[PDB]
Point group: C3
Chain length 344, copies 3
C-alpha cells in the first residue's frame, strides 16, 4: 500500500505539473464597447487592369487581359507610367472624419484626411487613408467619407475599398482585389466594418512581436516569395514590388508573362509557409456589411463606419503557480500525508 | 527549514485567498438560439430639422440650420407647435409583426402594433413601436413591418430608425441621430439587427440594478447635464427635455442659441461621467445589416428583423469556496503537513 | 473539534466531487481563421405558390392563395405535375466557384457545380448546390455564382436562397421560406454568410451523434409530425413529404385543405418537441448580410460569399481528475491532516 500510494502520489504530481506548464493558454471572449477606437486604414485601389478606364475607354470592345497585354505591347509603356495613369480615374477630391449630429458638420468640425496616394499594388496605384489618433465612440462611431471626382460619366466602372489595420499597411493592399469590397463609381456606398482585437501571450516557444515587426516580416517574406518565381520567369520586378532593389523594373515585353504568372502565384499564396511571429496586440477589421445609398451621382462617395462593438479575445493562463503548489500539496496529503517538512 | 517553509505556507495561502476574493469575475461566451426572443423597440424619428419637409418644402433653397433658425424667428413658432408639426411627414398608417410563411398572412395572423407617437427627441416628435411579450424564434425570426404614408412624392427625404431595448426607452431616442439607421422615404428598407445579452453579477463594490432603474438613472443624469449647460446659456428647456418642471419651455428667440449649444453638448456627452449602476440582465440590439428592397414606392415600408442568433455573455466565478479550502489545505500539507486538527 | 472538523472534511470533499462530476461543461469561444472552409449548400427555392409565374402570369389579377386553390381545382393538376412546373421559371444556366483575382477567371479555373434540381419543398421544386471538398481561405473566401435564365422579363418575381449545411440537407429546405433570403429575379444579389462551428462533448446522459444521424432523426420526426396532422385532415401526403410510402399522394380536391393546414402546422413547429440527439461536430451558416449589385439584368446572378471568420464554440471540461484528487487531498490535509496511508 505504501508502494502503490507512492506510485500514485508521483503520478498525480506529474499530471498537475503537466496541466500547469504543458497546457495551452485559455482564451477570454468579450464584446466590449470601447469609448475610443482606432479607425482602420482604408485603401482605395483600382479594379482589374482589364477594366481601367485608361484602357477600356479608348478602345471599342470591352478589353480582356490578353487584349490589355497586346495594347501594352503596341503602345510601348513604361510600366511605371502605366501604373501612374491607372489612378487618374477616381481623382480624390475630399476625405474627412465627421460625426452624424443633429446639426450637420460643415468643413469646421470634420477632420480632413490626406491620403497616401502613392501606394503600388497588383492593380495599379492605390490611395491609403488613415487616422493618427483614436476617435471617441462613447455616443456613436463617427463616419469617414472619401469623395472622388471623375471626368466622364463612367458606366460599370469599379474600385476596391479594403479596410485594414494601419499596422498592416505594407502587406494589405496586395490582397485588396480579393479581400476588398467592390465600390461602384459615381455612387455612394457605406462599408460598415467590425473590429476584432486579439491579445496574444508572449510565449518562449512562440514569442509574439509588435505589429510593426510582424508586418515587416510578412512584407519581406512576400517580397522574397514573389521574386523567386519572378526570377524563375524573367528575372525582373513589377511596379508593385520593392525588394530586389538593384534588379531592374520589368518592361512592356516581359510584363505580360510576369503578371500572368504572378496572378496564379498570388492565388495560392499562403501565409502559413511564411513563418513569422504572431502579434502580441493585433487588431483586425472585418466588413460587417455594405449598403448602397441613392442612385447615380457626379461623385463617388465612400462611407466607412461601424455600427458594432469590438470583439476582444484575450489569452490568459487559468492555472497560477500558487494553485500548482496547492494541488501538489493536496496530492501529497492524500496519497502519503507527506509535506516539505516531512520529506526533508 | 521550518522558518522558510512557514513563510512559504503563509504566502501560498495569501495567493489563494487573493485569487478567490480579489479577482475579476470570469465571462462565459455563447452563441445561443433562444426559442423565444424579446423584440427591440423601434424608434422612428424625423431627420435633422434642416431637412424636415415642413421647412424644406415651403421655401425655395435647401435650408441650412441657420436658415431654419431665421425662419423660426420670422414666423414666430411655439416650439411645441414646431415639434408637433415635424412628425406630420411620415403619418404612420400600419405596423404589425408578421411571419414569413408559405401562405402570406393577411390582417388576421399578423399582430397589430400601436406606436407611442408622442416621444420628444432632439430632432422632433418620434414614434416608438414595441411588443409586450416575446415572439417564437424556433423556426425563424418574425418580421416587424412599419408602414408610413405621405402627402407629396417626397424626394431626398429621410427618417431615422433606431433599434433599442424597451428597458432603455427613456435615454435612447436622444442619440437616434447618431445611433440610428437612415431610412429613405417612400422606399422599403430592411434593418436586420443582432441581440447581445449580458448577465452581470451583482457585486458589493459594483452592485447591478434592474434595467428600469439604470434607465431612470441615465435619464436623470442626462436631464441634469443638459439643464446645467442650458441654464448657463439662457435658463430654459427645449421641447425634448422634461426635467426642470417649473422652468419654462424656450421660445423662438432663445431656441436657436440653445439648440446650437445642445448639439455641441451632445457631441461629446459621455456616459462614463454619468456614474450609474450596471444592469444585472441587459439586452442590447445592434444593427447586423441594412438592405434596400425595390425602388420608389407610395409608402415607406420599414422592415425590422434578425437573421442571427443571440450573443450571451454570462459573468460567473471560476473559483468556489470549496476549492479555496482545498487549495489552502494543499498548501498546508505541502509546506508543513499541518491541518485544522494539528494547528488546534 | 474532531467531530466538527470531520463533518467539514466530508462536506468539502462532497463539494469537490460535485463540481467535478455534477457540473456543466465549460465553453471556449474563438474567432478562428481556418485556412480551409467547408462551403454551405445553397438551396434555391421558388417563392410562395401564389406568386409563381406559372400561375401569376396566365391570369389577370395578382393571384391570392385561395385563387390558386380554385385554379388547381379548375384545371385538374396532378400535384406532381404542378410541383414540376413551378421550378421552370429560373432555369439554371450556370453555377461555379470562382475566386476574385487580378485576372478574372474564365471557364478554366472556376469549378463547375451541378445542382440537385429535384428537391421537393413546401413551395415547389428546389435546386441544391453543394461542394464536395473544402476551398482554400488563406488569402480570401472564394465566391459561388449561380446563374439563372428566364423566358420573359419578369417583374416583381422572387426566389429564396437558403444557406445551410450539407449535413442538414434533409430538413433544411422546408424552412427556406422563413429562414431563406429573398432574391429578386433578373437582378444580381450577394449573400455573404457567416460560419458558426460548435464542437459538443459526447455525454452519457446527452450523447451527441454524427450530423448524418441527427439530420436523419430530424427528417423522420418532421415526417411523422406532418403525417399525423395530414392524416387527421385527409389521410394523404403532399408532394414534398416522402414518409408514408404506401400512402398515396394528394390530389387537387384534397390539396387545398392539406396545404392550408400544413402552413399553420409549420408556423408553430418546434424542434424541441422532436427529441433528437445533438451533433458532436455541427456547422451552421448564418447570413452576415445581403447586397444588391446593379439594376435590371437578363439573368439572375446569385453570389454566395463570406467576408468573415469562423466562430468556434468548443465544449471542454475545466476540471480534470488529477485536480479532483489534489483538492480532496487538500481538504483532508486542512481539516484532519489525513491521507490514504493514514486512513488505511
Amino acid at each position: 500500500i505504501i508502494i502503490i500510494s507512492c506510485i500514485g502520489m508521483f503520478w498525480n504530481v506529474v499530471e498537475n505539473i503537466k496541466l500547469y506548464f504543458y497546457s495551452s493558454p485559455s482564451v477570454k471572449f468579450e464584446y466590449i464597447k470601447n469609448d475610443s477606437l482606432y479607425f482602420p486604414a482604408i485603401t482605395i485601389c483600382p479594379f482589374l487592369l482589364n477594366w481601367n478606364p485608361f484602357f477600356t475607354e479608348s478602345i471599342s470592345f470591352f478589353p480582356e487581359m490578353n487584349d490589355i497585354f497586346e495594347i501594352i505591347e503596341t503602345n510601348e509603356y513604361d510600366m511605371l507610367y502605366l501604373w501612374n495613369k491607372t489612378d487618374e480615374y477616381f481623382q480624390y477630391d475630399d476625405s474627412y472624419v465627421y460625426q452624424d449630429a443633429l446639426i450637420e458638420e460643415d468643413e469646421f468640425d470634420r477632420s480632413s484626411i490626406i491620403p497616401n496616394t502613392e501606394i503600388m499594388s497588383v492593380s495599379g496605384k492605390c490611395h491609403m487613408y488613415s487616422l493618427e489618433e483614436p476617435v471617441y465612440i462613447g455616443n456613436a462611431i463617427p463616419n469617414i467619407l472619401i469623395v472622388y471626382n471623375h471626368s466622364k460619366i463612367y458606366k460599370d466602372k469599379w474600385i476596391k475599398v479594403l479596410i485594414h489595420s494601419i499596422e498592416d499597411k505594407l502587406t494589405s493592399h496586395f490582397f485588396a482585389i480579393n479581400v476588398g469590397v467592390d465600390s461602384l463609381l459615381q455612387q455612394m456606398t457605406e462599408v460598415n466594418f467590425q473590429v476584432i482585437q486579439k491579445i496574444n501571450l508572449n510565449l518562449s516557444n512562440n514569442p509574439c512581436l509588435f505589429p510593426e515587426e510582424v508586418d515587416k516580416c510578412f512584407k519581406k517574406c512576400l517580397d522574397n516569395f514573389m521574386f523567386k518565381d519572378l526570377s524563375r520567369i524573367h528575372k525582373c520586378r513589377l511596379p508593385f514590388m520593392d525588394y530586389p532593389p538593384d534588379i531592374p523594373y520589368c518592361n512592356y515585353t516581359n510584363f505580360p508573362q510576369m503578371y500572368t504568372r504572378f496572378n496564379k502565384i498570388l492565388k495560392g499564396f499562403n501565409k502559413t509557409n511564411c513563418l513569422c511571429p504572431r502579434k502580441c496586440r493585433e487588431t483586425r477589421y472585418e466588413i460587417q456589411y455594405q449598403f448602397n445609398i441613392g442612385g447615380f451621382n457626379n461623385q463617388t462617395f465612400i462611407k466607412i463606419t461601424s455600427r458594432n462593438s469590438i470583439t476582444l479575445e484575450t489569452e490568459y493562463w487559468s492555472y497560477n503557480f500558487y494553485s500548482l503548489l496547492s494541488d501538489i500539496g493536496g496530492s501529497l496529503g492524500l496519497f502519503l500525508g507527506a509535506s516539505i517538512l516531512s520529506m526533508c
